[PDB]
């Protein structure tokens, strides 16, 4: 039983990271091509060490060290996939017939979620049968998302060369940050105070924040700030393909490695599974070698 949850979590993490290879036609991080090559090289070293840790600790029944090696492999495999997916995008967009497009100022999905979370927290802290503890827990949700919104505003301000947009992203973030401080002040103010006037008073302090959040959502929704997707030409997709296939093969074999290790950890008396394990481990290594060679040969 012990060790199996680590393996199950790793297999779930692999299933998630594999979506990055389905249509890698947009950037997924800020890594340069050499950033990608550096990350692939470092993770190759880490994974090599982890694959040896997985086999040796399953063999010897060191189940805490086995679990750490499974977790370490998983993290290195996810890093590899992120680097491979970014590298593929950069290869595709570098083709002469590709159109690179532009980065949007604010990632829209997490932006909308942050605004909704603040709005829902403000509504929750205002519900009539809500306990004082729920007021405080709602405040922590507001603080979390207020910090994320401010960071994203500072980034958006950095990304734009338009002085008016530069200034407005900061001012809008400032309005959100100061309204949260006033709301937190009023929550902190509540001490042994659980009366209808303070319930109404907390509700009252949500208004400037909800308005500031709405004003920022309206400002940030200007189509001028939106991403314009890259267009990858057929030849760019052909150029990316060896990187994508090698990364997909690494993950397929890594998944088999982890499934095999999960069984061997419980029962290491299994000569067939030991060969399968060595086969998956060598195919993982072969795929990484092919991916690095492909990243160098197909380099823009």
């Amino acid at each position: 039983a012990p060790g199996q949850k680590e393996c199950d979590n790793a297999l779930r993490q692999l299933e998630t990271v594999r979506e990055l290879l389905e249509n890698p036609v947009q950037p997924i991080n800020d890594m340069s091509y050499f950033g990608c090559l550096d990350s692939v090289m470092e993770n190759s070293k880490v994974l090599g060490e982890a694959m040896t840790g997985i086999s040796q600790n399953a063999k010897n029944g060191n189940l805490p060290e086995f679990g750490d090696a499974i977790a370490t492999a998983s993290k290195a495999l996810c890093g590899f996939t992120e680097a491979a997916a970014q590298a593929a995008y950069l290869v595709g967009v570098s083709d002469p017939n590709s159109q690179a497009g532009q980065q949007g100022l604010v990632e829209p999905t997490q932006f909308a979620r942050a605004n909704q979370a603040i709005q829902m927290a403000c509504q929750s802290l205002g519900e009539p049968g809500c306990t004082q503890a729920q007021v405080l827990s709602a405040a922590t949700i507001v603080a979390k998302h207020t910090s994320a919104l401010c960071n994203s505003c500072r980034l958006a301000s950095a990304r734009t060369a338009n002085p008016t947009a530069k200034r407005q992203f900061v001012q809008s973030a400032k309005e959100v940050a100061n309204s949260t401080a006033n709301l937190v002040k009023t929550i902190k103010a509540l001490d042994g105070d659980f009366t209808e006037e303070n319930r109404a008073q907390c509700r009252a302090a949500t208004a400037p924040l909800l308005e500031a959040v709405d004003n920022l959502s309206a400002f940030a929704s200007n189509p001028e700030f939106s991403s314009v997707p890259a267009q990858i030409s057929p030849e760019g997709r052909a150029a990316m393909e060896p990187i994508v296939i090698s990364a997909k093969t690494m993950l397929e074999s890594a998944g088999g490695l982890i499934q095999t290790a999960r069984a061997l950890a419980v029962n290491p008396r299994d000569p067939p599974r030991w060969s399968v394990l060595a086969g998956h481990s060598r195919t993982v290594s072969d795929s990484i070698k092919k991916l690095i060679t492909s990243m160098r040969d197909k380099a823009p």
């Binding site: 603080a143 973030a173 400032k174 940050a177």
Partner: peptide, 19 residues
């Protein structure tokens, strides 16, 4: 602590207030 907690949550908020 009630102040330490909200400080941990508010992240790098000061970079905006000072700005």
């Amino acid at each position: 602590d009630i102040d330490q907690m909200f400080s941990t949550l508010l992240g790098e908020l000061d970079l905006l207030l000072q700005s």
